[PDB]
Each structure stands twice: as C-alpha cells, then as structure tokens.
C-alpha cells in the first residue's frame, strides 16, 4: 500500500455518520509479528471518523470483549448523557451513541474506553481511534495545498502474542511499551510529495510522553487539543502528554531524510533499588530517545507561506468562581488523590452553573507529571507553573510537572454529571478522578 | 583516659608471651551505645600482642562461643601445623598455640578466626586483634623519637544491640557497616605531642576498603604487610584492602586540625534494581567519604628528618615454577572460584618445594576487587595490572582490581598444608580458597 500507513477513514454521508463498530479480540500483524489485540472495527488503531460541524453521528458499539466497556468521546463538547462515563456495556451487548457535532468546533479528537478500573488494560490492548472535525478553515490555500497526515502515537509491549499484562509497578507509573509505533507501524517512512505537511498528532498512549522534534526543522503549531490557535506558533519541539492532540505545519527546507524523534523526557516514573539498606524508590530518569518515523523531503522543496491568521479565540465572560484542585500521590500504594480523596462515582465533588465561566487552579503536589483531563467542557490554559501560555486555543488535557499550578478558564457548557481525571489512565483507574455536576 | 584509644598491650616477659584468651560474647560500650560483641580478652579490638624476634608465644585460646572457632596468625611465617587453618576448637574447649617468632621479622600482624564457612560472622562480630613484632630498627633515632600509634580500622553495624546479621547481598559483596571505627572508637581525636607520628595501620574489616588520605599532608610509607620497605616512600594516599597492614610516618607541617579520611573508592560492590523489565544487578559505585579521626598538630611542629634507609630486601634465588591462579565470580549465586573450583579441604591444589621460589600470577577475571591472601609464605609483589611495584617489601595480601594480574615472587618456607584465599572473608566462606602443600 502507501509507504505511510494511516487508519482507514469513515466519512459522514449527507450529514450522517452511521456506523456499527465491534470491540473484539483481533488477530493482527503488528510491527512484523502476529498478535491478538483488542480493536475497534478490526484494526489497530480503530478507524478514523471524519465529520463536519452539525453532522449527526450514530455509532453503535457492540461489545465482543469478555468484560464490560464503554466509549469516551475524548474532547467533544457534547452532553454527558451521551458521552456517559458511568455507562457500562456488558459483554455481548450493544449501545448506540447519537449526537450532533457542535457548530463551532474543529480539530482532532479521539475515542477510547472509559469504564473505571478497566481503562488502562483496555486502552493498552488497542482500543482507540481518531475523530476529525473538518473546518471551513481547511479550505484556505495555505492549508488546502498542504499534504495532510494523521499520526497516532501509541506504544505497545507484547508477551506471548498478546498485550503484556500490567505489573504492580505499571499501576504506579502508568504502563509504557518497548514498541513505539506510529499508526500501529514501527518507524514508517513518510515520503512527502509536497513541501508543506499538515500533521495531526495524537498521543493515545497510556502513559508515554512524546517530546517531539523533527531533525533540522521547527514545527508550526496551528491547533491544540480542541481547536485552532489564533495564528501559527513556531516551536523547536512539542511535548505531547497522554491524551493530548496537536496539529502542526512542517515546511520542508531541503531535500533529504529527517528523523521525527521522541527526545528524552523525564516524567517522574519510579523504579526500586536495593543497595544494602533499602529497598526504596528511585527515579527512572529520562526516557531513551526514540525514532518515530523517517521523513523524506521531495526534490527542490518550496513550502507554501504560513497562513497569517487561523481562528479568533472567543472572548469569554468574566468568571464567577475559582476552584482549587490539588493532586497528590501515594506511590508505594499506587493510590492517587484529588484534594485528598479517591474517586467515588456516588459523590459529587464540584457543582457549577451552565453557561458560566470558572477559573480552575490545578496544583500538582506530586513528583510525577500528571496530565489533567476534563470531560465535556474544553478550557483555555492561562498559565502553567506561573508562566503565561503563549497562545489561545481550546484544550482538554493540560500537563503538570511536579509542583506546577495550571490556571484554567473553564466555560461550563452542557448540563449533567461528568468527570475530571489524570490521563495517565492507570492513575485514573487507581483513584485520581472526581465528579463535576453542571446545572 | 587518653584522648586516643588504643587496645591494651601485652608484652613478652623474658622472651615468653604466655597468655590465656577467651573468645566470648561480651557486653561493651561501643561508639556511645551498649552492645554485645564477640571478643578476645573482653575487649574490642582484642589486646595487642607485642613481641620480639625469637620470643616464644604460648597462647591458649578458650572457646566460649556457641560455635567452633580457631585462630589464624595472619602474616606470620610460622608452621602451618601451628597456624592450622583446618583445626576446629569446639565450644567450651581450649587449644594452645605455641611458636617461636622468626628471627628475620618485623612489622604489624594480626589474629582472627579462620574456620571455613564461619569466618565472616565471627570476624564481623569483633573477633580480632593486633600483633606487633618489634625490631632493632625501631631504635634508630628517626623512628625512636616518633610518636607511635596503632590504628585498627574496622567497621560495624548494630541491630538490637548485637552485630547485624548477614543478608544474602552481604554474602555476595562482603559486609560493610555504617559505624566506621578506629580502635573501636567513633572518630577519635589524636592530639599529637610530637611533630612526627609513626602510625601502624591495620584493615581488620570484612570487606570495607580505606582509601587513606590525611588533609594537607603526604604519608611516608615505611612498612607493608609483613616488613619494612628498603627506604621510605612518599605517597599522597594509601589504599588499605581487607587484611592489609602498613606503617607510615606523618610529618606534621603546621599547627591545626587535620582530618584523616577514607576517601571514596569503588570496589565493585553490587546492588539490585528494578526499572520496568528487570530485576538486575547494578554497581553500588564509590563508597561515601568517611572521617576516620581528627589529628591535632602540636605548636610549632618541627618534624624529624626521615630515615635514609630502613631494611635491605633479601636477594631471592631464581624461581623454579610459574603458577597461574584465575579468580572468577558467580555473583547471583554468591559463589567464588579459583581456576574454576570452590574450596575443598580434602583437595590439594598446588604442590611446591620448600626453600624454592615460585612466581604466582594471580588474575582477577571478576568485576569486584579481590584482596588475595596466602598463609605462611610472605611474598614480594613484582607488578599489579602490568605496573611495576614501586618498592620491595614482604606482603601477604595483594589487592586486584577487575581484570588485573598480580605477579608475585613466593619463597616457600615451612613445610605442610596451608591455604590461599580472598580476604573479603565472605568470599572465602563462599568458596574462594585453595590448598597449597609444601614438601
Ligand atoms: Cu481520553
Ligand atoms: Cu475520562
Ligand atoms: Cu497521574
Ligand atoms: Cu587474615
Ligand atoms: Cu586465611
Ligand atoms: Cu573476593
Ligand atoms: Na471486529
Ligand atoms: Na572474656
């Protein structure tokens, strides 16, 4: 096929995307080896759903797993009665998700399981796929003429032809795998045909971070998790935490082969050592560098000019409340807390008013990085670690290094009960999740 | 008492040192705490025996321990029928060691248990003491006028008022303790009354190395394990491996306080870590620096001149055989080998001829330092690691770093069966010992 593997795309037809997926154990060829993964739609990653604003999505999920499951429409500002984090689909049963794509929306989103206590093994085993909301902005020449690709970054570890099981240390750190894949392929080659590439990036890993850098090139950030920036932002590298998305333009500068790498990054994962007294926890330190793909530039590349503007960011009403949410850890117990409590699905932690704006101050008092995710209500990151954010865009995951405070501007949209949690999904499964009720 | 603690001295009287020692569990005050140690003569260290050449030593060892024991007269070139490594003294029984001190002998020696499989816990618990052979060379003015002190370097760890037990890792590495003591005292102060000090140094530790350095001063080496050098040798530091002895002159250069330190040294001890895959062995790295004692110099110190000569080293006959003895390790089993075999007291490994000279090439093919010790027959170290030795003196322990070959000139003296072994005594207990028969 193409030298660059990408998930099959399913497009809405006449304003309707109607599709039956099955979550199923699936024999696959993966990275040169045969393995049985848990997949949506028979593939790893699952199919990319491509829709436009105001489309109707009608997705029937058939559960062919031996355990219950559900879907989280990660990043979509839809009703928590559709994107229902408490729903359980029993083995053999089906459930239809039906919603309308919001009118003021664009970007790369994704879908994956969200059944508390079972997310990490199900996501690690292969249950994920992308959703793209196309925009009228995609027609401006500087983007229309770019070569577009989706990059699903997800790692894996195999044992006996199946996803490796979680160890106790995996529940503490979040599980990372040795197979560092792009769209399920090991170090694919992207042979560019145009000098400007538009790359949609998705970190669908349980816990691995991707400190992205393209050899000899900057990246031009044009979209964050849930929407466009106001104008492109030049960066030398781009850290993508679990659950985050971005879209970048790449302007190929000369002929040649350029590595896209995940550079060394220390997220605070911990090991154990015994040096006499002991045993006690010790930092794992930075990740080893990984090559994600090989990028081959065309002959005599002449990249397009960058767009001068993208989409203006909405002016938000003045906020009506400030919240403080402190993250802490008990690493040796693999227990994780928000304001000193673990998740309880019966307990409402925050009560807010629809169509008001809130300021959320999320403080990481742990030693690990924690990527904080809020369902249903995209937010504007004002600052992290006391540094102002260099752009305005909708996000739904924000990474906090040890000790850092993020200040978020959170407009409350749809009414109902939803959740916020760490998107190191092992930590969510082990308690680092709370309940927000909007009325 | 004196600001500088030293073991009580027992001197020969009229050419006879006749003494009854008991090896006994003993309540002591040690480093500010009460503890029960295993001691000779009720003290830790045991009493220093001080003799002259041709003295008769008659030492009755009474075993009041709950397990068998014996004595090794470490470094003395006497008969292996007296210095008997295979003898067992049962609990409650006594044995008299009787020997004549050789005529051509001088230096610092020591005594400790040597019952195979039980040495490490008995030595660690406190069973050791020094023996000094006085020399007519001690009357030359440059030594007679020096202030003489014995420094027994031995570390300890206490648990519940008793020596800490050996762990599996202790059997692999050799046990080191957190209490780093001199003559059983924690960081004593030596208030010098003379500007020249003569320090007898003994490493009586199971496994700890002492990379000795005196702040702002060199050391003048005048004797190795088993005798004087030919002339003093200036050194900036002096590594003392387990079982080694040295004598140094210190020439105090000005008033003040000077630390005698055990500087960081990496002997190849190993720990265990678990960082995801794992678990696997990892180097412990260098030891942490320790202060051994505080040295206070007198006012306006005017040190004596160094002696120009000490004792000429004997011219040895040409050697008649070359031996090769390869040291290897199985760290995870805590098994240690010489030429691929573990100790067997029934098996003779080398057979040599009395009054001939042999060349022994001892090769460390392990990753840890191993201090190689030969009973009964002191040797001349020719080279280690391919570097010629910078002095001629009798030694009976030679340290080998990983990969190093030591070339030794070994005159065979007394007839009989004796042993050679690593003086990390845990390694001896775990097999790194062989049998030499001299006829
Ligand atoms: Cu998600
Ligand atoms: Cu969630
Ligand atoms: Cu977390
Ligand atoms: Cu010894
Ligand atoms: Cu021995
Ligand atoms: Cu050894
Ligand atoms: Na299927
Ligand atoms: Na006693």
Kindly give the distance from the C-alpha atom of residue B162 to the centroid of ligand 8, in angstroms, as a whole number.
16
Kindly give the distance from the C-alpha atom of residue A439 to the centroid of ligand 1, in angstroms, as a whole number.
24
Rg (CA), chain B: 21
The reply to whether A109 and A192 lie within a common domain is no
Residues 6+ apart with CB under 8 A from A228: A106, A107, A135, A137, A222, A247, A310, A311, A393
Instruction: Extract the tokens encoding B177.
Output: 């303790």
Rounded to 5 degrees, what angle do the CA atoms B163, B169, B172 make? 105
CB contact under 8 A, B274 and A273: yes
Q: Which residue has 């003379």 as its token pair?
A: B194
Closest to B273 (Cβ–Cβ): which among A176, A271, A276? A271
Structural domain ending residue among the three candidates A100, A134, A168: A134
Q: What is the H or E stretch that residue B339 is in?
A: none
Residues 6+ apart with CB under 8 A from B15: B52, B54, B55, B56
Would you give the end-to-end CA distance of chain B in angstroms? 51
Binding-site entries of B for Cu(2+): 74, 112, 114, 370, 375, 421-423, 427
Residues 6+ apart with CB under 8 A from A311: A106, A135, A137, A227, A228, A229, A230
- What residues of A are in contact with residue B176 (Cβ under 8 Å)? 276
Kindly give the distance from the C-alpha atom of residue A153 to the centroid of ligand 1, in angstroms, as a whole number.
14
Flag whether A345 is marked binding.
Answer: no
Structural domain ending residue among the three candidates B311, B341, B360: B311
Q: What is the 3-state secondary structure (H, E, C) of chain A?
A: CCCCCCCCEEECECCEEEEEEEEEEEEEEECCEEEEEEEECCECCCCEEEECCCCEEEEEEEECCCCCECCEEECCCCCCCCCCCCCCECCCCEEEEEEECCCCCCEEEEEECCCCCCHHHHHHCCCCEEEEECCHHHHCHHHHCCEEEEEEEEEECEECCEECCCCHHHHHHCCCCCEEEECCEECCEEECCCCEEEEEEEECCCCCCEEEEECCECEEEEEECCEEEEEEEEECCEEECCCCEEEEEEECCCCEEEEEEEECCCCCCEEEEECCCCCEEEECCCCCCEEEEEEEECCCCCCCCCCCCCCCCCCCCCCCEEEEEEEEEEHHHCEEEECCECCCCCCCCEEECCCCEEEEEEEECCCCCEEEEECCCCEEEEEECCEECCCCCEECEEEECCCCEEEEEEECCCCEEEEEEECCHHHHHCCCEEEEEEC
Residue-level length of chain A: 439
Instruction: Extract the tokens encoding B381.
Output: 């170290």
The reply to whether A192 and A247 lie within a common domain is yes
CATH number, domain of A281, equals 2.60.40.420
CB contact under 8 A, A273 and B272: yes
Give the CA dihedral B136, B138, B140, B146, nearest 10 degrees.
Answer: -170
d(CA B373, CA B244): 9
CB neighbour burial string for B15-31, b if at least 16 within 10 angstroms, e if fewer = eebeeebbbbebebebe
Say if residues A41 and A22 touch (Cβ distance below 8 Å): yes
Range of the domain at B31: 1-134
d(CA A46, CA A43): 5
Say if residues A174 and A427 touch (Cβ distance below 8 Å): yes
Say if residues B358 and B322 touch (Cβ distance below 8 Å): yes
The reply to whether A325 and A424 lie within a common domain is yes
Kindly give the distance from the C-alpha atom of residue B173 to the centroid of ligand 6, in angstroms, as a whole number.
8
What are the backbone angles phi and psi of residue A248, rounded to the nearest 5°?
-130, 150
- What residues of A are in contact with residue B274 (Cβ under 8 Å)? 169, 271-273
Say if residues A337 and A366 touch (Cβ distance below 8 Å): no
Q: Which of A276, A280, A288 to mutate to test the interface with B (most CBs of B within 10 A)?
A: A276
Rg (CA), chain A: 21
Q: Are strands A129-133 and A48-51 parallel, antiparallel or unpaired?
A: parallel
The reply to whether A167 and A305 lie within a common domain is yes
Query: In angstroms, what CA-CA distances link B371 with B80, B83, B194?
Result: 21, 20, 34
- What residues of B are in contact with residue A176 (Cβ under 8 Å)? 276
Give the closest-approach CA distance of A388 to chain B in angstroms: 35
Q: What is the H or E stretch that residue B432 is in?
A: none
- With CA atoms as reference, the chain B residue closest to A275 would be B271
d(CA B335, CA B332): 8
Say if residues A260 and A218 touch (Cβ distance below 8 Å): no
- Three-state SS at B221: strand
Cis before A322? omega within 30 = no
Say if residues B376 and B84 touch (Cβ distance below 8 Å): no
Residues 6+ apart with CB under 8 A from A315: none
Say if residues A154 and A243 touch (Cβ distance below 8 Å): no
CB contact under 8 A, A271 and B274: yes
Handedness of CA B335, B338, B340, B342 (dihedral sign): negative
- What residues of B are in contact with residue A282 (Cβ under 8 Å)? 273
Residue-level length of chain B: 439
Kindly give the distance from the C-alpha atom of residue B421 to the centroid of ligand 4, in angstroms, as a whole number.
10
Q: What is the 3-state secondary structure (H, E, C) of A284-305?
A: CCCCCCEEEEEEEECCCCCCCC
Give the closest-approach CA distance of B25 to chain A in angstroms: 26
Return left, alpha or beta for B169; rule: phi > 0 is left, psi -120 to 50 is alpha, else beta. Answer: alpha
Give the closest-approach CA distance of A271 to chain B in angstroms: 4
Which of A369, A431, A432 is CA-nearest to residue A406? A369
Strand order in the sheet with B48-51: B9-11, B48-51, B129-133, B107-112, B72-74
The reply to whether B64 and B77 lie within a common domain is yes
Q: List the resolution, Å.
A: 1.8
The reply to whether A287 and A341 lie within a common domain is no
- The residues that bridge with B258 in the sheet, in sequence order, are B295
Which of A250, A259, A256, A113 is CA-nearest to residue A182? A259
Side-chain-side CA neighbours of B185 within 13 Å: the count stands at 16
Rounded to 5 degrees, what angle do the CA atoms B291, B293, B297 make? 125
The reply to whether A323 and A387 lie within a common domain is yes
The reply to whether B141 and B263 lie within a common domain is yes
Kindly give the distance from the C-alpha atom of residue A19 to the centroid of ligand 7, in angstroms, as a whole number.
13
Q: What is the H or E stretch that residue B133 is in?
A: strand B129-133
Structural domain ending residue among the three candidates B84, B117, B134: B134
Quick count: other Cβ atoms within 10 Å of Cβ A165? 12
Give the closest-approach CA distance of B257 to chain A in angstroms: 33
Query: In angstroms, what CA-CA distances link B245 with B185, B267, B339, B408?
Result: 19, 18, 27, 18
Say if residues B146 and B194 touch (Cβ distance below 8 Å): yes
Quick count: other Cβ atoms within 10 Å of Cβ B429? 26
Instruction: Extract the tokens encoding A410.
Output: 């959170």
CB neighbour burial string for B257-296, b if at least 16 within 10 angstroms, e if fewer = ebbbbbbebebbbbbbbbbeeeeeebebeebeebebbbbb
Give the ligand whose atoms come closest to the C-alpha of residue B207. Answer: 6
Give the CA dihedral A382, A384, A389, A392, nearest 10 degrees.
Answer: -40
Instruction: Extract the tokens encoding A428.
Output: 């969510």
The reply to whether B290 and B162 lie within a common domain is yes
CB contact under 8 A, A274 and B271: yes
Q: What is the H or E stretch that residue B215 is in?
A: none
Q: Which residue has 């196309």 as its token pair?
A: A134
Kindly give the distance from the C-alpha atom of residue B171 to the centroid of ligand 6, in angstroms, as a whole number.
10
Which of A177, A150, A229, A140 is CA-nearest to residue A37? A177
Which of B412, B191, B369, B342 is CA-nearest to residue B269? B369
Strand order in the sheet with A147-156: A185-186, A179-182, A147-156, A196-203, A245-251, A219-224, A227-235
Domain count within chain A: 3
- What residues of A are in contact with residue B271 (Cβ under 8 Å)? 273-276, 278
CB contact under 8 A, B273 and A273: yes
Kindly give the distance from the C-alpha atom of residue A8 to the centroid of ligand 7, in angstroms, as a whole number.
14
Experimental method: X-ray
The reply to whether B272 and B217 lie within a common domain is yes
The reply to whether B384 and B307 lie within a common domain is no
Give the closest-approach CA distance of B334 to chain A in angstroms: 15
Give the closest-approach CA distance of B240 to chain A in angstroms: 22
Quick count: other Cβ atoms within 10 Å of Cβ B341? 13
Q: Which of B179, B275, B280, B331 to mutate to test the interface with A (most CBs of A within 10 A)?
A: B275
Which of A255, A277, A152 is CA-nearest to residue A210? A152
CB contact under 8 A, A274 and B273: yes
Instruction: Extract the tokens encoding A287.
Output: 């990740």
d(CA A371, CA A366): 12
Q: What is the 3-state secondary structure (H, E, C) of B84-106?
A: CCCCCECCCCEEEEEEECCCCCC
Give the ligand whose atoms come closest to the C-alpha of residue B371. Answer: 6
The reply to whether B144 and B127 lie within a common domain is no
- What residues of A are in contact with residue B169 (Cβ under 8 Å)? 274, 276
- What residues of A are in contact with residue B284 (Cβ under 8 Å)? 275-276
Handedness of CA A14, A16, A20, A23 (dihedral sign): positive
Give the closest-approach CA distance of A155 to chain B in angstroms: 15
Closest to A276 (Cβ–Cβ): which among B271, B274, B278? B271
Query: In angstroms, what CA-CA distances link B258 with B187, B192, B252?
Result: 12, 11, 9
CB contact under 8 A, B271 and A272: no
d(CA B361, CA B373): 13
Burial of B33 (0-12, 13-18, 19+ CB in 10 A): exposed
Quick count: other Cβ atoms within 10 Å of Cβ A316? 12
- Three-state SS at B291: strand
Handedness of CA B132, B135, B137, B138 (dihedral sign): positive
d(CA B181, CA B35): 15
Q: Would you list which residues of chain A are within 8 Å, Cβ to Cβ, of chain B?
A: 169, 176, 271-276, 278, 282, 284
- The residues that bridge with B30 in the sheet, in sequence order, are B33
Quick count: other Cβ atoms within 10 Å of Cβ A32? 8
Say if residues B211 and B267 touch (Cβ distance below 8 Å): no
Local structure of residue B13 (DSSP, 8 states): B
Please count the residue pairs, one from chain A and one from chain B, whose beta carbons lie less than 8 angstroms apart: 29
Residues 6+ apart with CB under 8 A from A340: A326, A328
- What residues of B are in contact with residue A275 (Cβ under 8 Å)? 271, 284
d(CA B44, CA B53): 26
CB contact under 8 A, A282 and B271: no
Say if residues A142 and A393 touch (Cβ distance below 8 Å): no
Query: In angstroms, what CA-CA distances link B147 with A60, A373, B183, B195, B250?
Result: 94, 74, 17, 8, 10
């Amino acid at each position: 096929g193409p030298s660059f593997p990408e998930p099959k795309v399913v497009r809405s037809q006449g304003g309707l995307l109607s599709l039956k997926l099955s979550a199923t154990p699936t024999p696959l060829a993966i990275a040169g080896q045969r393995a049985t993964l848990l997949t949506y739609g028979g593939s790893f990653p699952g199919p990319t759903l491509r829709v436009r604003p105001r489309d109707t999505v009608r997705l029937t999920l058939e559960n062919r797993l031996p355990e219950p499951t559900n879907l989280h429409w990660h990043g979509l500002p839809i009703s928590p009665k559709v994107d229902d984090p408490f729903l359980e689909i029993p083995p053999g049963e089906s459930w239809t998700y039906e919603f309308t794509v919001p009118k003021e929306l664009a970007g790369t989103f994704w879908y994956h399981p969200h059944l508390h206590g079972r997310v990490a093994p199900q996501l690690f085993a292969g249950l994920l796929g992308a959703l793209v909301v196309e925009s009228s902005l995609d027609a401006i020449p500087e983007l229309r003429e770019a070569e577009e690709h989706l990059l699903v970054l997800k790692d894996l570890a195999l044992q006996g032809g199946r996803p490796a099981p979680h160890t106790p240390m995996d529940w503490m750190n979040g599980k990372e795998g040795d197979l560092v894949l792009v769209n399920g392929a090991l170090r694919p080659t992207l042979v560019a045909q145009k000098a400007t590439l538009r790359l949609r990036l998705l970190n669908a890993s349980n816990a691995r971070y991707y400190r992205l850098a393209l050899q000899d090139h900057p990246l031009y950030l044009i979209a964050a998790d849930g929407g466009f920036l106001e104008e492109p932002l030049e960066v030398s590298e781009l850290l993508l935490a679990p659950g985050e998305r971005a879209e970048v333009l790449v302007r190929l500068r000369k002929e040649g082969r350029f590595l896209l790498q995940a550079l060394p990054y220390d997220r605070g994962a911990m090991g154990m050592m015994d040096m006499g007294g002991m045993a006690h926890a010790m930092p794992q330190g930075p990740s080893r560098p990984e090559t994600l793909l090989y990028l081959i530039a065309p002959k005599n590349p002449k990249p397009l000019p960058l767009p001068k503007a993208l989409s203006p960011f909405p002016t938000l009403p003045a906020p009506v409340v400030t919240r403080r949410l402190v993250l802490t850890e008990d690493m040796m117990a693999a227990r994780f807390f928000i304001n000193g409590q673990v998740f309880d699905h019966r307990r409402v932690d925050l009560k807010g008013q629809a169509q008001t704006v809130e300021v959320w101050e999320v403080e990481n008092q742990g030693d690990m990085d924690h990527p904080f995710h809020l369902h249903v209500h995209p937010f504007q990151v004002l600052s992290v670690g006391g540094r102002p954010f260099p752009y305005r865009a909708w996000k739904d995951v924000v990474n906090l290094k040890a000790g850092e405070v993020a200040r978020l501007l959170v407009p409350l949209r749809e009414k109902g009960r939803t959740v916020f949690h760490c998107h190191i999904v092992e930590h969510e499964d082990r308690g680092m999740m709370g309940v927000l009720e909007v009325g």
